Every structure is written in C-alpha cells, then in structure tokens.
A paper describes a structure:
Here, the first new protein structure determined by 3D electron diffraction data is presented: a previously unobserved polymorph of hen egg-white lysozyme. HEWL has an ability to crystallize easily in different lattices and space groups, and this characteristic has been greatly exploited in X-ray studies devoted to surveying different protein crystallization techniques. At present, among the deposited HEWL structures, 540 belong to the most common tetragonal form P43212 with one molecule in the asymmetric unit, and 52 belong to the monoclinic space group P21 with one or two molecules in the asymmetric unit.
The crystal structure was additionally validated using X-ray synchrotron-radiation sources by both powder diffraction and single-crystal micro-diffraction. The determined unit cell does not correspond to any HEWL structure reported to date in the PDB. Subunits A and B in the novel HEWL polymorph were substantially analogous (r.m.s.d. of 0.60 Å for Cα atomic coordinates). Considering a narrower subset of intermolecular interactions, namely the potential hydrogen bonds among residues of neighboring chains, it appears that the new structure can form about half of the hydrogen bonds that are found in most known HEWL polymorphs. Finally, it appears that the residues that can form interchain hydrogen bonds are not the same in the four examined models; therefore, the packing of the novel monoclinic HEWL is indeed unique within the HEWL polymorphic system and cannot be traced back to a distortion of any known structure.
Author numbering: 1 to 129
C-alpha cells in the first residue's frame, strides 16, 4: 500500500507518534517519505544478509526476525513480514522501541540526512488532522 502523505500523517498521529520521545509528527512523515516513499511493502536487501522492511525500513539484523540474517537479534520481538502489513501498527510499535534507545531517530539515516534540522512541519502541512 502507498499511503498518501496526509493519510499516513493521520495514522501516525492516531498511533501516538506525535512528539513521541520529543519527535514531532512531521519528523515521522519525513522519515517514512525518504525511507520507503510511503510504501509499506518497501524492502531493501543489504550484502551482509540483513534486509530493511516496510514503511520505516526496519533492519532484520537488530529489530525483527526474517530467520535468514546471520546477525541476528529480534529486539522488537516480531517477524519482519509483520512490518510489510498495510496496517502500520507493527512498524510504529517497533519504531517506538528503536527511537527510545538514545540514538533516537538518528537510527534512520534517511532522516538524519534528509529531515533532521529541517522544517519538518512542512510534511503535515495541508492535511489538517
Ligand atoms: Cl514520549
Ligand atoms: Cl511536525
Ligand atoms: Cl513528496
Ligand atoms: Cl529478504
Ligand atoms: Cl517498517
Ligand atoms: Cl547467526
Ligand atoms: Cl546481531
Ligand atoms: Cl517473532
Ligand atoms: Cl506490534
Ligand atoms: Cl535527534
Ligand atoms: Cl505547504
């Protein structure tokens, strides 16, 4: 499923991402935008045998189990396939665990490089949730 910007903003706000660990809603929309382009089926295999899954490109080395990553931890305690759902709950809950870890959203490189320090409120602008 390819969420629209505003449709995705409302789901993330509805899932309590707004100002979660101090990160306003635009940050999460922006991170989704440059991680996956709002696509819940987005995948990205790395050469180390890890793969990035779903709308926030969560990596199977640390966070989820795909059972084919020699890493590997499952710190969000979920299957990586749950992160490819058109329901964003599993991605959002795993994101909350990651962002709580003191790296914060710097965990997401696309957010560091594309979103961080920018006017992220732009992303929720023209939605009105
Ligand atoms: Cl919080
Ligand atoms: Cl914002
Ligand atoms: Cl865009
Ligand atoms: Cl894979
Ligand atoms: Cl994800
Ligand atoms: Cl192993
Ligand atoms: Cl590991
Ligand atoms: Cl699991
Ligand atoms: Cl969950
Ligand atoms: Cl930060
Ligand atoms: Cl605008």
């Amino acid at each position: 499923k390819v969420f629209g910007r505003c449709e995705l903003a409302a789901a993330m706000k509805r899932h309590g991402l707004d100002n979660y660990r101090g990160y306003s809603l635009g940050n999460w929309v922006c991170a989704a935008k440059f991680e996956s382009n709002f696509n819940t089926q987005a995948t990205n295999r790395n050469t180390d045998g890890s793969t990035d899954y779903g709308i926030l490109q969560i990596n199977s080395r640390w966070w989820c189990n795909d059972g084919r990553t020699p890493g590997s931890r499952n710190l969000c305690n979920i299957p990586c396939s749950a992160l490819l759902s058109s329901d964003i709950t599993a991605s959002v809950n795993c994101a909350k665990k990651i962002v709580s870890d003191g790296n914060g959203m710097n965990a997401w490189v696309a957010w560091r490089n594309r979103c961080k320090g920018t006017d992220v409120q732009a992303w929720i602008r023209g939605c009105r949730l």
